Enzyme design. Structure first.
Site, PDB file in Angstrom:
ATOM      1  N   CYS B  46     -74.621  -5.873  38.504  1.00 17.38           N
ATOM      2  CA  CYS B  46     -75.258  -5.146  39.597  1.00 17.38           C
ATOM      3  C   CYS B  46     -75.444  -3.680  39.153  1.00 17.38           C
ATOM      4  O   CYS B  46     -74.644  -3.128  38.380  1.00 17.38           O
ATOM      5  CB  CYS B  46     -74.383  -5.213  40.837  1.00 17.38           C
ATOM      6  SG  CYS B  46     -74.916  -4.203  42.269  1.00 17.38           S
ATOM      7  N   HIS B  51     -73.675   2.278  37.769  1.00 18.42           N
ATOM      8  CA  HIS B  51     -73.377   3.590  38.364  1.00 18.42           C
ATOM      9  C   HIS B  51     -72.003   4.082  37.913  1.00 18.42           C
ATOM     10  O   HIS B  51     -71.810   5.286  37.865  1.00 18.42           O
ATOM     11  CB  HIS B  51     -73.491   3.556  39.893  1.00 18.42           C
ATOM     12  CG  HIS B  51     -74.855   3.355  40.442  1.00 18.42           C
ATOM     13  ND1 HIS B  51     -75.996   3.703  39.763  1.00 18.42           N
ATOM     14  CD2 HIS B  51     -75.228   2.972  41.690  1.00 18.42           C
ATOM     15  CE1 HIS B  51     -77.039   3.472  40.585  1.00 18.42           C
ATOM     16  NE2 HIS B  51     -76.571   3.078  41.754  1.00 18.42           N
ATOM     17  N   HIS B  67     -67.943  -6.593  40.387  1.00 18.98           N
ATOM     18  CA  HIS B  67     -67.693  -6.846  41.812  1.00 18.98           C
ATOM     19  C   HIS B  67     -68.520  -7.994  42.363  1.00 18.98           C
ATOM     20  O   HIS B  67     -68.306  -8.315  43.538  1.00 18.98           O
ATOM     21  CB  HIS B  67     -67.955  -5.598  42.657  1.00 18.98           C
ATOM     22  CG  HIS B  67     -69.351  -5.110  42.592  1.00 18.98           C
ATOM     23  ND1 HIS B  67     -69.883  -4.475  41.478  1.00 18.98           N
ATOM     24  CD2 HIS B  67     -70.344  -5.214  43.526  1.00 18.98           C
ATOM     25  CE1 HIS B  67     -71.189  -4.163  41.762  1.00 18.98           C
ATOM     26  NE2 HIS B  67     -71.538  -4.669  43.007  1.00 18.98           N
ATOM     27  N   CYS B 174     -72.566 -10.012  45.912  1.00 19.82           N
ATOM     28  CA  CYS B 174     -73.112  -8.685  46.182  1.00 19.82           C
ATOM     29  C   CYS B 174     -74.600  -8.737  46.427  1.00 19.82           C
ATOM     30  O   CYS B 174     -75.040  -8.537  47.576  1.00 19.82           O
ATOM     31  CB  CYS B 174     -72.757  -7.674  45.078  1.00 19.82           C
ATOM     32  SG  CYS B 174     -73.513  -6.087  45.575  1.00 19.82           S
TER      33      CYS B 174
HETATM   34  N1  LIG Z   1     -75.343  -1.060  50.012  1.00 15.80           N
HETATM   35  C1  LIG Z   1     -74.787  -1.996  49.242  1.00 15.80           C
HETATM   36  O1  LIG Z   1     -73.875  -2.742  49.653  1.00 15.80           O
HETATM   37  C2  LIG Z   1     -75.260  -2.178  47.900  1.00 15.80           C
HETATM   38  C3  LIG Z   1     -75.141  -3.448  47.249  1.00 15.80           C
HETATM   39  C4  LIG Z   1     -75.732  -3.616  46.009  1.00 15.80           C
HETATM   40  C5  LIG Z   1     -76.429  -2.670  45.410  1.00 15.80           C
HETATM   41  N2  LIG Z   1     -76.483  -1.398  45.968  1.00 15.80           N
HETATM   42  C6  LIG Z   1     -77.303  -0.371  45.383  1.00 15.80           C
HETATM   43  O2  LIG Z   1     -78.645  -0.713  45.557  1.00 15.80           O
HETATM   44  C7  LIG Z   1     -79.468  -0.164  44.516  1.00 15.80           C
HETATM   45  C8  LIG Z   1     -80.296  -1.227  43.878  1.00 15.80           C
HETATM   46  O3  LIG Z   1     -79.444  -2.116  43.116  1.00 15.80           O
HETATM   47  P1  LIG Z   1     -80.103  -3.217  42.177  1.00 15.80           P
HETATM   48  O4  LIG Z   1     -81.194  -3.940  42.869  1.00 15.80           O
HETATM   49  O5  LIG Z   1     -78.980  -3.909  41.512  1.00 15.80           O
HETATM   50  O6  LIG Z   1     -80.778  -2.197  41.116  1.00 15.80           O
HETATM   51  P2  LIG Z   1     -81.976  -2.258  40.095  1.00 15.80           P
HETATM   52  O7  LIG Z   1     -82.124  -3.634  39.582  1.00 15.80           O
HETATM   53  O8  LIG Z   1     -81.774  -1.147  39.150  1.00 15.80           O
HETATM   54  O9  LIG Z   1     -83.270  -2.024  40.977  1.00 15.80           O
HETATM   55  C9  LIG Z   1     -83.720  -0.713  41.343  1.00 15.80           C
HETATM   56  C10 LIG Z   1     -85.232  -0.659  41.280  1.00 15.80           C
HETATM   57  O10 LIG Z   1     -85.625   0.643  41.685  1.00 15.80           O
HETATM   58  C11 LIG Z   1     -86.807   1.008  40.929  1.00 15.80           C
HETATM   59  N3  LIG Z   1     -86.992   2.432  40.991  1.00 15.80           N
HETATM   60  C12 LIG Z   1     -86.311   3.343  40.283  1.00 15.80           C
HETATM   61  N4  LIG Z   1     -86.762   4.534  40.639  1.00 15.80           N
HETATM   62  C13 LIG Z   1     -87.739   4.415  41.557  1.00 15.80           C
HETATM   63  C14 LIG Z   1     -88.685   5.307  42.315  1.00 15.80           C
HETATM   64  N5  LIG Z   1     -88.544   6.603  42.106  1.00 15.80           N
HETATM   65  N6  LIG Z   1     -89.444   4.605  43.191  1.00 15.80           N
HETATM   66  C15 LIG Z   1     -89.523   3.303  43.362  1.00 15.80           C
HETATM   67  N7  LIG Z   1     -88.786   2.436  42.636  1.00 15.80           N
HETATM   68  C16 LIG Z   1     -87.943   3.052  41.774  1.00 15.80           C
HETATM   69  C17 LIG Z   1     -86.502   0.431  39.562  1.00 15.80           C
HETATM   70  O11 LIG Z   1     -87.651   0.337  38.755  1.00 15.80           O
HETATM   71  C18 LIG Z   1     -85.832  -0.916  39.854  1.00 15.80           C
HETATM   72  O12 LIG Z   1     -86.685  -2.018  39.827  1.00 15.80           O
HETATM   73  C19 LIG Z   1     -78.498   0.553  43.560  1.00 15.80           C
HETATM   74  O13 LIG Z   1     -78.377   1.943  43.923  1.00 15.80           O
HETATM   75  C20 LIG Z   1     -77.147  -0.113  43.893  1.00 15.80           C
HETATM   76  O14 LIG Z   1     -76.041   0.694  43.571  1.00 15.80           O
HETATM   77  C21 LIG Z   1     -75.954  -1.215  47.226  1.00 15.80           C
HETATM   78  O1  LIG Z   2     -73.190  -2.812  44.845  1.00 15.82           O
HETATM   79  C1  LIG Z   2     -72.228  -2.666  45.883  1.00 15.82           C
HETATM   80  C2  LIG Z   2     -71.613  -1.267  45.908  1.00 15.82           C
HETATM   81  C3  LIG Z   2     -71.874  -0.339  46.907  1.00 15.82           C
HETATM   82  F1  LIG Z   2     -72.780  -0.582  47.862  1.00 15.82           F
HETATM   83  C4  LIG Z   2     -71.283   0.877  46.938  1.00 15.82           C
HETATM   84  F2  LIG Z   2     -71.524   1.764  47.895  1.00 15.82           F
HETATM   85  C5  LIG Z   2     -70.341   1.194  46.000  1.00 15.82           C
HETATM   86  F3  LIG Z   2     -69.672   2.372  46.057  1.00 15.82           F
HETATM   87  C6  LIG Z   2     -70.025   0.298  45.042  1.00 15.82           C
HETATM   88  F4  LIG Z   2     -69.071   0.611  44.117  1.00 15.82           F
HETATM   89  C7  LIG Z   2     -70.639  -0.936  45.025  1.00 15.82           C
HETATM   90  F5  LIG Z   2     -70.302  -1.780  44.010  1.00 15.82           F
HETATM   91 ZN   LIG Z   3     -73.303  -4.516  43.903  1.00 16.41          ZN
END
Ligand SMILES: NC(=O)c1ccc[n+]([C@@H]2O[C@H](COP(=O)([O-])OP(=O)([O-])OC[C@H]3O[C@@H](n4cnc5c(N)[nH+]cnc54)[C@H](O)[C@@H]3O)[C@@H](O)[C@H]2O)c1
Ligand SMILES: OCc1c(F)c(F)c(F)c(F)c1F
Ligand SMILES: [Zn+2]
Ligand SMILES: NC(=O)c1ccc[n+]([C@@H]2O[C@H](COP(=O)([O-])OP(=O)([O-])OC[C@H]3O[C@@H](n4cnc5c(N)[nH+]cnc54)[C@H](O)[C@@H]3O)[C@@H](O)[C@H]2O)c1
Ligand SMILES: OCc1c(F)c(F)c(F)c(F)c1F
Ligand SMILES: [Zn+2]
Ligand SMILES: [Zn+2]
Ligand SMILES: [Zn+2]
EC number: 1.1.1.1
Lengths: 374, 374
Positions: B46, B51, B67, B174
């Site tokens: 993920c 990060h 995770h 996740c």
């Molecule tokens: N809230 C939660 O529980 C939770 C869970 C899982 C992931 N996350 C977060 O969610 C985000 C996405 O995770 P993911 O899908 O695994 O990531 P990922 O696979 O890196 O996807 C992110 C996407 O964003 C695109 N991107 C980057 N910059 C820009 C821009 N300026 N405008 C438009 N698109 C852009 C990028 O090209 C990529 O396809 C990350 O920040 C994770 O840390 C949060």
């Molecule tokens: O991808 C899920 C995820 C989150 F949404 C967070 F906010 C965070 F702090 C983290 F460590 C995490 F794994």
């Molecule tokens: Zn995650």
């Protein structure tokens, strides 16, 4: 008889920011198609009207302000179907066109015909019905209630109960409905919940009323003016806190008091810092915070989006989320049926000629609502 | 054969930010009371694990990250009642203690025992079960799934269907559940609505899946990597836009495309600017925007609160708003019954030993989810 004729009457004209209103003769044109000319009976002094004076709100000047009022229809333009001469009415500073995507949405009230976002200070047709000393004078929010007579678009007026006491129900045109709806409709306060209300003016007291109506178990009033606390408690506050009494930031105090954050918080002041404090003090996983106050034009707040990622909801609303033309008559009917009280909001009743004195009472902290009577 | 004994196994240890993981032997202590030791079977990569590497997410180092995973219980500590040796399980990075005010709330999921808000990198008892080169190694979110064996608190594990394919259902730990829930549970996307999804990685694809499941009529994908668009359309996007193709800011483009703003927007990237853009592009009176992306540590966004005052709702959520231990087994049962698909998210499979190649694939933009097999 005045129907079809220009009326010369008294109004409170604001010629420039940070000056007293000038009470003087204006000319009010007759209503055009789909317009309504209203003889004003009573208008409240809302902080938003003071924001025009102070420059917190930018709107074209010179202007006839005033947006919280009630009066009697003097005449109608061609094509008006929803009011008639002699009807009691409340002008609607948020219109209800009934046709836009917002009006058609079950939860929208901020009609696209509003003159708030990007104020022109005109009628819907882009012209003004007011002149003073030979100069055109701007409207304010389609309402301009600081005048013995105004002209409004049909979509900016609601017919109300003919037996309505206009010196009370004018508050349904802004501050009561805004605060009450912010609690019952926008936040959807739940029975047994803990609420925090920032700012204990007319609008904040109305938020308390709504929180108590919704069955909140605890309602914490927050104000830097402790003279506001007795009336807050009368209308339902269980506790009041003054941030100035604490070494800690008030969000920390309120989080402690509520054993980990409140269910619902309301910003009812108009400060960027209190908007962020109010969000922070709601429980991080399921709290809701509602912005009601109006802060200084073109200023951004700073905040950490982790406050939202954990699960908080942040929202704002105009006019308590109420669809204005559907809701105002129902609220007046509910007032007539003793479902809520308005007298707790009214601290002063002055003739219209004392508008400046009424604004000085608000600025000095003394008043909640002054009602001006024509 | 290993119950009550220290297990030596391989793990991917992160000793330093901005460096490769080190695959090397660690010692995994046996579970204490109310702990569960799990033999890992599959773990997804993920962006939140990346990060930790980049310093976007600050957590104590050295650390065993990971995770999003699934495995088989090797042993249980004293007093464990909810899983047994041999059970298939998903570790829960958001715990569900079942006792705190959040767990008891009908809409809360961010349990107060989480290690996300202010990470300690420990078990619930404030200690580590991991040793490497004789040094204690931090846990991550109570899960630490980048290891052949991990130890988790009981509140951080869910028993799942014994017939589960663990190399698929790890994504329920996740990315799938987060994106799907963010649409169906947090935003509550409606039939016929217009959605905008910023970021088309595994989580944003899962958001699209949920918006389509909810009946959205239009789902607009937004990414700066146009290679992401084909898969986004396969899972339900009706159209995709690359901000780099436009002279005007994308909030203006999206407002035009949606004839006045979208019903639902999702930030699924982790940038402050796209959080504000995503809010802006939802309809000003009734739009809803959900923050899903993880923002950079300790950085504040700037925004005009007039965006909220008009009626917008802004919220965020962890893990799609799902109460984790209640929801994960149900999500696995639904996957078994073909109620949603996980294969569209899986673009690469690698052995655990090739974890660094898996992170290279994510950083290059090539992959959605790489699934590592132990
Ligand atoms: N809230 C939660 O529980 C939770 C869970 C899982 C992931 N996350 C977060 O969610 C985000 C996405 O995770 P993911 O899908 O695994 O990531 P990922 O696979 O890196 O996807 C992110 C996407 O964003 C695109 N991107 C980057 N910059 C820009 C821009 N300026 N405008 C438009 N698109 C852009 C990028 O090209 C990529 O396809 C990350 O920040 C994770 O840390 C949060
Ligand atoms: O991808 C899920 C995820 C989150 F949404 C967070 F906010 C965070 F702090 C983290 F460590 C995490 F794994
Ligand atoms: Zn995650
Ligand atoms: N959203 C809407 O539709 C809407 C409607 C009506 C009013 N408003 C706004 O709502 C706000 C309140 O209006 P009102 O009740 O007429 O105003 P008011 O009567 O001036 O009340 C404001 C209260 O805030 C208190 N206060 C000031 N600074 C602080 C502080 N730092 N901490 C805590 N308390 C503080 C102050 O003492 C006073 O009691 C104003 O910004 C209005 O412009 C918005
Ligand atoms: O008090 C109601 C009120 C508002 F909520 C505004 F946002 C505004 F701009 C204004 F002029 C106004 F009168
Ligand atoms: Zn409308
Ligand atoms: Zn007002
Ligand atoms: Zn809990």
């Amino acid at each position: 008889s005045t129907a079809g004729k220009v009326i010369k009457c008294k109004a409170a004209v604001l010629w420039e920011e940070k000056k007293p209103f000038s009470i003087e003769e204006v000319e009010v044109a007759p209503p055009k198609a789909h317009e309504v000319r209203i003889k004003m009976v009573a208008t409240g002094i809302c902080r938003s009207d003071d924001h025009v004076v102070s420059g917190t709100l930018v709107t074209p000047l010179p202007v006839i302000a005033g947006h919280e009022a009630a009066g009697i229809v003097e005449s109608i333009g061609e094509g008006v179907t929803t009011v008639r001469p002699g009807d009691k009415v409340i002008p609607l500073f948020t219109p209800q066109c009934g046709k836009c995507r917002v009006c058609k949405h079950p939860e929208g009230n901020f009609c696209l015909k509003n003159d708030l976002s990007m104020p022109r200070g005109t009628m819907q047709d882009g012209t003004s019905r007011f002149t003073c000393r030979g100069k055109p004078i701007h409207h304010f929010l389609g309402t301009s209630t600081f005048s013995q007579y105004t002209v409004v678009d049909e979509i900016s007026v609601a017919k109300i109960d003919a037996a309505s006491p206009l010196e009370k129900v004018c508050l349904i045109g802004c501050g009561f409905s805004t605060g009450y709806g912010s609690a019952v409709k926008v936040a959807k306060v739940t029975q047994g919940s803990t609420c925090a209300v920032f700012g204990l003016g007319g609008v904040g007291l109305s938020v308390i009323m709504g929180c108590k109506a919704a069955g909140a178990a605890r309602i914490i009033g927050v104000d830097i003016n402790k003279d506001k606390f007795a009336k807050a408690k009368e209308v339902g506050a269980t506790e009041c806190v003054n941030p100035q009494d604490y070494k800690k930031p008030i969000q920390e105090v309120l989080t402690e008091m509520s054993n980990g954050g409140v269910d619902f918080s309301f910003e009812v002041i108009g400060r960027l810092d209190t908007m962020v404090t109010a969000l922070s003090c709601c429980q991080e996983a399921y709290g809701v915070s509602v912005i009601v106050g109006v802060p200084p034009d073109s200023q951004n707040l700073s905040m950490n989006p982790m406050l939202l990622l954990s699960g908080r909801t942040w929202k704002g609303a105009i006019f308590g989320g109420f669809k204005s033309k559907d809701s105002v008559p129902k609220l007046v009917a509910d007032f007539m049926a003793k479902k809520f009280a308005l007298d707790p909001l009214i601290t002063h009743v002055l003739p219209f000629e004392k508008i400046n004195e009424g604004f000085d009472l608000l600025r000095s902290g003394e008043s909640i609502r002054t009602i001006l009577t024509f």
